[PDB]
Amino acid sequence: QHANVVWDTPSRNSSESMPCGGGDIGMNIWVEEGDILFYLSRSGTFDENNCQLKQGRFRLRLSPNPFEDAKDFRQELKLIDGYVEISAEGTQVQLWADVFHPVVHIEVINDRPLQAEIFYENWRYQDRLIRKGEGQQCSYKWAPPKGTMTHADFISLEDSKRLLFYHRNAEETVFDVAVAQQGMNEVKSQMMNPLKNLTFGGYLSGENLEYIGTSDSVYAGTDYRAWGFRSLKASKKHHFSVVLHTEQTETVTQWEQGLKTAWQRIAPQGKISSKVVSQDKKQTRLWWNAFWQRSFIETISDAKDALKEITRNYTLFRYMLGCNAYGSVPTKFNGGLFTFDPCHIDEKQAFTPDYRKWGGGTMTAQNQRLVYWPMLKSGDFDMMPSQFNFYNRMLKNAELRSHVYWQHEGACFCEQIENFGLPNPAEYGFKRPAWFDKGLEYNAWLEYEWDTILEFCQMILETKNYAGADITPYLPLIESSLTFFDEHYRLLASRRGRKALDGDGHLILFPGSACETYKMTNNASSTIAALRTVLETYIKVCNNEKWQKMLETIPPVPLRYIEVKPAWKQTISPAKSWERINNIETPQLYPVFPWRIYGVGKENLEIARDTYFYDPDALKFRSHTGWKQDNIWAACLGLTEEAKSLSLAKLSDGPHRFPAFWGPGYDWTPDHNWGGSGMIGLQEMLLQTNGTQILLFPAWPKEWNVHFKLHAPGNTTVEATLKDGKVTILKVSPESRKKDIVIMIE
């Protein structure tokens, strides 16, 4: 038992919008001065500058409008069935997306016959020059070449099919620019190109509609054109469909064809088969019903109000993640699929609705990982490949890097990575010395940060461990990723000295970095904990000995002493050595999470706790904002009250009307690494794994009553309840695992 989001009065602007999606599609939906407005974003729609374009904005007006000064207004997110419902006296509108097909549906049911106008609004009707600061939404960031523009869409007026909109990419894209910049033209002809000719759009369609002409205005400081359709005859029912298609094609004909094929499915002889759309609808709702059975964290005086808040928000976010199961590319951290008009976020950055900070086809690994990690314990295993394929798609490209720059095998996956496997052109350096290594970013924050891929590698393996997933398509990726660290730091040492290993026969991890925070490291704890834990884990799943050899070559995690404001405390060191500090991450707790070397029910917990409580960089960097993992670590170290405080802070209502729209923090709104991280935190307070143990309530307060169900390794599922400090229930499946449970509530 939980709660939907119910607004009983209309919304003022696009920031006061509601998420709704499914499949690879996300809509922001709201009602403003009697109009039903929805933005429509789909995963993977990257322009020639690698900006994530929204497909458009949709407007629905009824006449006489029952939403004008309406009594009994109600916009409701109907979680269980994954659809939004807007209703007022004798009218009921439903919006949903098919989970199994790229199609949005609007349904109107009126007691009396009403008239309906539907408008398709597109602000890319003509070329628009990228203004100062607008580059952040693309790969050029702060330095878009003079005369760089967002190219125009192709709208046109030709069954029930009415309107055709699409954007098409040219042959020349930021890919070709970046290939040149980083000197890989030699091997360009062997590289996957995600952007060349990439085309994406669809049909607006309905029965009982005529065209009512074009019209021009401004929505949120953004000029736009609108095409309008009006129903020939008033009617008790009205049904509109939007049908999308995405593809790289030699001609526009080829693309159109694929769109037609998708359109025919739902309109076999030109009309929208309400038989077919009923199956689609039924399927979709079952899927959502199943969705809310995979996992949950629910409740059962303002203490309870606050718990309800975070559990509610935890859930609302999970909905948002759900909207992009089966995306070809992952839910992005910086807005996801639910960006709105920038001006509501920052007036200095008031650009098109296609705008967000930190790029579109450009995705920072450290953020992306926080979106996905929580999908293991929530059982959302089928969504995670969206994230895995992103990297698998560019494995050949990331390898050709290492071939070109250092003539060795293995994939070089930079931190701020494009969808084509090279680092972001801007961060690589536009004004860089001729002599500098072509494989290295001319960058103080990013140089030698290649280790986040290993977190995704761990995710892949953990899908096997948690859900028996078939991960055969990924093994090459995992192997190539490890091969790099071995072949790189061997070669670097052999070029510098006579020995390629240290005197303990271990790898010499220099130059490295501990995330983006400690730079030019020797033997960072973060990178080590990773190689150790990935290899340990990949050994259990591969008899080959090359991997046990390499595990023996991994140096130990470095520790150190710190004085306390005497007495000395022993903590985890950032690294054996570093040159400087350029950020506010805390990679000396990466052995706590993600790699779970230290943690509850594991050795030397006192070391980790002291790192959390006394490392003065960690103290200084502690926070609940954005990606800050202090909430996670607190929980993994069994510090309730600390975890309680942070998780309260992290998951409490965001600044917009929908309460799980958090941001912008260090990123963009809706911040998804905010949600993601926050999920992780709540999850770890309840359930942790320690070998084959399942530790329940490791960092959960007695006075928080809870009913949850989370996953654990070996297709295991734990449903439990705490009430007035008693574990009143336990339902465990398979039952053989019930004896592995350890209750920790004291």
Residue numbers in the entry: 21 to 178, 184 to 325, 346 to 610, 622 to 802
Task: Give passages from the manuscript.
To date, family GH139 is the only family known to be able to degrade α1,2-linked MeFuc, making it essential for RG-II metabolism and a feature of RG-II-degrading bacteria. In this report, we present the 3D structure of BT0984GH139, alongside its homolog SDT91673.1GH139 from Verrucomicrobium sp. GAS474, an organism isolated from forest soil. Crystals of BT0984GH139 formed in space group P212121 and diffracted to a resolution of 2.7 Å, while crystals of SDT91673.1GH139 formed in space group P 6522 and diffracted to 2.05 Å, providing good quality electron density maps in both cases. Both proteins adopt a three-domain architecture, consisting of an N-terminal β-sheet domain leading into an α-helical domain composed of a core (α/α)6 toroid structure. GH139 enzymes operate via an inverting mechanism in which we propose that N412 functions as the catalytic base and E561 acts as the catalytic acid (BT0984GH139 numbering).
